[PDB]
Design a protein around this ligand. Structure first.
Ligand code: HFK
Ligand code: GAL
Length: 392
């Protein structure tokens, strides 16, 4: 019932720097960071061209490296949880021979970003990878690794594209090298985060808006269920198809174009669970617009209520909660000073997010833990910077 330390960039950096020196016999030339994420509200909307309101965490991936002359890529990760081996070397992709997902799985993320990197000529490089983002724990550790990799390659071989195109490359790596067909939110927030802000993302227009979240009276408590059901992986793609089925049945580019009234009128053009999937999305888009407006005018009680409606919608209509997350959310809404709690991320495990009076965090942590059938982990996180570069 104490909050896990968030190592500052400097401490992850020093760790990365020391391990690079030992491994490659020289100081690294380059450092980059990319954070993980919590979604405050707007879940399972990004791939429906909806609205999301994520914020970057102090939990981050740091990559320190140097270009090579031999066209080789040599990687080391110190991340506990990374599958063996911790080291991998491979030649750069060419027109002849492209890179290929396999073992270790953590290198599929670097390989994917290298494979789809849009600028040339890319030299080889040596790199060490460290992360405080818990691996597969629901706060976008993969997006953080992809975005750190992309930022690194930018120093090796500057691209000339938009932040969206960069997000879309990281997203391509996730799809093609990790078999997770994600939307754009995780990569976009990892790129675009700013200290003291949430980011409202319009996943149709790709327009972004920085929204202040820096009030000392207020905290964001992230709770890790420290569970992941296999459905986290297998049912993600299923929901994407169900949403597509419903958009096609109504003659709509995306569920962004569909309102509840339009959806209710067409009940008999779609399945029962179809209709439930689409009721959540339409409702979550509306709620994210309302949450954004609420947050701007300091109305945390309204924000929290919209967080609770998002969870109920995800529980009952989208059916991507599990008993573990449900227990954690119920626990948190019992604590005075808590404005709202919901599951965040894909679901079927991972984290919940709780907006509360800062004074209440310790009482929330004790109570959530005591009421939770597993062992919860806690992060108290302010809104953090997106991808960053430090010349060494
Ligand atoms: O097995 C899964 C399925 C669900 C999502 C999750 C993966 C694994 C695959 C490799 C071993 C740990 C779990 N890793 C990530 N993310 C991540 N692994 C990293 C390694 C170093 C630095 C940053 C990293 O971010 N995502
Ligand atoms: O809100 C649900 C989210 O699930 C995420 O974990 C996925 O990577 C995102 O792109 C988004 O779809």
């Amino acid at each position: 019932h104490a909050a896990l330390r968030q190592p500052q960039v400097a401490e992850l950096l020093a760790e990365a720097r020391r391990a690079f020196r030992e491994e490659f016999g020289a100081e690294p030339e380059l450092a980059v960071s990319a954070p993980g994420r919590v979604n405050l509200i707007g879940e399972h909307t990004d791939y429906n061209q909806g609205l999301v309101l994520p914020m970057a965490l102090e939990l981050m991936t740091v990559l320190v490296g140097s270009p090579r002359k031999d066209g080789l890529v040599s990687l080391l990760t110190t991340s506990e949880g990374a599958d063996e081996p911790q080291r991998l070397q491979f030649p750069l992709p060419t027109a002849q021979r492209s890179l290929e997902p396999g073992t270790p799985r953590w290198a599929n993320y670097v390989k994917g970003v290298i494979q789809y990197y849009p600028a040339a000529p890319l030299p080889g490089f040596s790199a060490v990878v460290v992360s405080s983002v818990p691996l597969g724990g629901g706060l976008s550790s993969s997006a953080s690794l992809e975005v750190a990799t992309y930022t690194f390659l930018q120093q090796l071989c500057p691209d000339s594209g938009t932040i969206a195109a960069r997000a879309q490359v990281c997203q391509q790596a996730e799809h093609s090298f990790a078999g997770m067909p994600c939307g754009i939110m995780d990569q976009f927030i990892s790129l675009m985060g700013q200290k003291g802000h949430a980011l409202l993302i319009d996943c149709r227009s790709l327009e972004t808006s920085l929204v202040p979240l820096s009030d000392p009276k207020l905290a964001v408590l992230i709770t890790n269920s420290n569970v992941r059901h296999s459905l986290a992986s297998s049912e993600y793609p299923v929901r994407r198809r169900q949403c597509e089925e419903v958009a096609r049945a109504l003659g709509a580019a995306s569920l962004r174009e569909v309102q509840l009234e339009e959806l209710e009128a067409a009940r008999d053009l779609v399945s029962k669970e179809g209709f439930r999937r689409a009721r959540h999305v339409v409702g979550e888009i509306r709620r994210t617009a309302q949450a954004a407006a609420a947050l701007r005018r300091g109305d945390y009680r309204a924000f929290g209520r919209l967080m609770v409606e998002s969870h109920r919608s995800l529980r009952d209509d989208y059916e991507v909660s599990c008993p573990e997350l449900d227990q954690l959310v119920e626990a948190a809404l019992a604590v005075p000073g808590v404005y709202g709690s919901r599951m965040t991320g894909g679901g079927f495990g991972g984290c919940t997010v709780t907006l509360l009076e800062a004074s209440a965090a310790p009482h929330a942590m004790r109570h959530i833990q005591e009421h939770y059938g597993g062992t919860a982990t806690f992060y108290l996180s302010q809104a953090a910077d997106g991808a960053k570069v430090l010349c060494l």
